[PDB]
C-alpha cells in the first residue's frame, strides 16, 4: 500500500528537475536547482533497491501462511456446501 | 479510433481468413475488428454448453456486441489518452537528461583546455624557479 | 520507465479488448466458464496477430489498487471472483 507514495514522490520529483532545469544552463556546475533536486532524487531512489529487502519476506510469508491454513480455510467450504445439500428437504434450509 | 499499426504483418492464418472486405493484405484494424467478430460468436457456444452441462440458460443478442464494442472504444480511448500524458512527460523530460548531458560533457573537456594549458603556464614557469637557484645560489660563491 | 510504456501502450489494443468482452458477456458465467471464455479470445488475438499482456488482470487493468480495497471495507468478498464483479458493477455499461 505504501508504494502509493513511491509513485507520487517520484513523479513530483520529476516535474521540479525539470522546472529547476529552466532556470540554469547558465550556471549549472554553480547552481542548487539542478544539483540539490537531482541528487534528492538519486538518494530516495535507491528505495526499491534497498528498502525491498522486506519486501521478499512479505511477499513470502503471504503465500507461506496461506498455505498453513488453506488445508483449514478448505474444509470451512466443505462444510458449507453440506448443508446446502441438506436443502433437499424442505425443512433443511441454510443460507450462507 | 486509430487501431492502425504500421509495423503489423497480418499472419497467415488471418490471411487465409480475410478471403475464404479486407483490402487485399488483411490490415490492423481487420485485426482487431474481425477479432470483436470472434470474441462476440463464442459466447452463443459458452451459452449452449452452459444448458447443456449445467442447468441455466443465457443469451447473447445484438445488444451485447453494441455494448460491447461501445466499452471497447471507450477503453481505448481512456487507457491511451493516461498512457500518452505518462510518455510526454517522459519524452520532454529525456530530451533535458540528454541535452543537459552535451553542454556539460563537453563543457568539463574545456575546463580540462584550462588545466591542460596550465600545465606549461605553471611547470615552465617553475622551472624560471630553477634557473634562479642554480643561477642565484651559483652567483653567491 | 520510458521504454516500458512502449510495451504497455503496444498491449493497450489487446488489454481493451479483452477487459471489455469480460464487462459485456462474462458477468453471467461462473469462475470455469469465465476462465474458460478468456482462454479462448487470447488465443485468437494471438492466431490473428495482436499484442496484449499475457497475464493480463482485468480486476487491476480497470481499477487502482486504492478503489479496490475501499470495496472490501464496504463489505465485499476478498475472493478473486466478487474482486471481478466489483469491477463489472463499476464499469457497468447496461444497468447490472
Redesign the interface.
Same mark, same amino acid.
Given at each position: 500500500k505504501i508504494q502509493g507514495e513511491f509513485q507520487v514522490k517520484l513523479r513530483i520529483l520529476?516535474?521540479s528537475?525539470?522546472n529547476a532545469?529552466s532556470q540554469?544552463?547558465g550556471n549549472?556546475?554553480d547552481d542548487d536547482s539542478?544539483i540539490s533536486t537531482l541528487e534528492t532524487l538519486k538518494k530516495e531512489t535507491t528505495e526499491i533497491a534497498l528498502k525491498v529487502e522486506e519486501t521478499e519476506t512479505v511477499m513470502q510469508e503471504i503465500s507461506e501462511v496461506s498455505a498453513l491454513y488453506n488445508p483449514m480455510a478448505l474444509s470451512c467450504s466443505r462444510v458449507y456446501f453440506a448443508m446446502e445439500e441438506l436443502s433437499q428437504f424442505h425443512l433443511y434450509q441454510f443460507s450462507l | 479510433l486509430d487501431?492502425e499499426?504500421p509495423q503489423?504483418?497480418?499472419?497467415p /492464418?488471418?490471411i487465409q481468413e480475410a478471403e475464404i472486405l479486407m483490402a487485399i493484405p488483411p490490415s490492423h484494424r481487420d485485426? /482487431?475488428v474481425?477479432?470483436?467478430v470472434?470474441?462476440?460468436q463464442?459466447?452463443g457456444e459458452?451459452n449452449i454448453?452452459?444448458l447443456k452441462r449445467q442447468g441455466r440458460q443465457?443469451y447473447?443478442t445484438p445488444?451485447?456486441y453494441l455494448?460491447?464494442i461501445?466499452?471497447?472504444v471507450?477503453?481505448?480511448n481512456e !487507457?491511451?489518452d493516461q498512457? %500518452?500524458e %505518462?510518455?510526454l512527460?517522459?519524452?520532454?523530460?529525456?530530451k !533535458?537528461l540528454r541535452d543537459?548531458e552535451a553542454?556539460?560533457k563537453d563543457?568539463q573537456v574545456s575546463l580540462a583546455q584550462k588545466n591542460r594549458e596550465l600545465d606549461v603556464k605553471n611547470e615552465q614557469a617553475n622551472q624560471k624557479l630553477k634557473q634562479m637557484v642554480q643561477d642565484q645560489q651559483a652567483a653567491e660563491i | 520507465?520510458?521504454e516500458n510504456?512502449n510495451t504497455?501502450?503496444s498491449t493497450?489494443?489487446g488489454?481493451?479488448?479483452l477487459?471489455?468482452?469480460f464487462?459485456?458477456?462474462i458477468g453471467?458465467?461462473d469462475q470455469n466458464?469465465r476462465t474458460?471464455?478468456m482462454r479462448?479470445?487470447m488465443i485468437?488475438?494471438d492466431?490473428?496477430?495482436?499484442k496484449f499482456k499475457s497475464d493480463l488482470s482485468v480486476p487491476s487493468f480497470?481499477s487502482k489498487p486504492e478503489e479496490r480495497l475501499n470495496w472490501h471495507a464496504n463489505s465485499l468478498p476478498s475472493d478473486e471472483l466478487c474482486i471481478e464483479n466489483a469491477i463489472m458493477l463499476k464499469?457497468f455499461?447496461?444497468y447490472p
Open positions: 520529476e516535474k528537475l525539470l532545469l540554469a544552463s549549472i556546475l539542478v | 487501431l499499426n503489423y504483418i497480418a499472419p /492464418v488471418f485485426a /482487431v474481425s477479432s470483436l470472434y470474441i462476440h463464442t459466447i459458452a454448453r452452459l443465457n447473447v445488444r451485447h455494448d460491447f461501445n466499452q471497447v471507450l477503453l481505448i !487507457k491511451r498512457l %500518452e %505518462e510518455q512527460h517522459l519524452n520532454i523530460g529525456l !533535458k543537459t553542454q556539460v563543457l | 520507465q520510458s510504456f504497455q501502450m493497450v489494443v488489454d481493451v479488448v477487459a471489455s468482452a464487462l459485456a458477456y453471467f458465467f466458464f474458460d471464455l479462448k479470445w485468437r488475438l492466431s490473428v496477430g495482436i480497470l464499469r455499461n447496461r
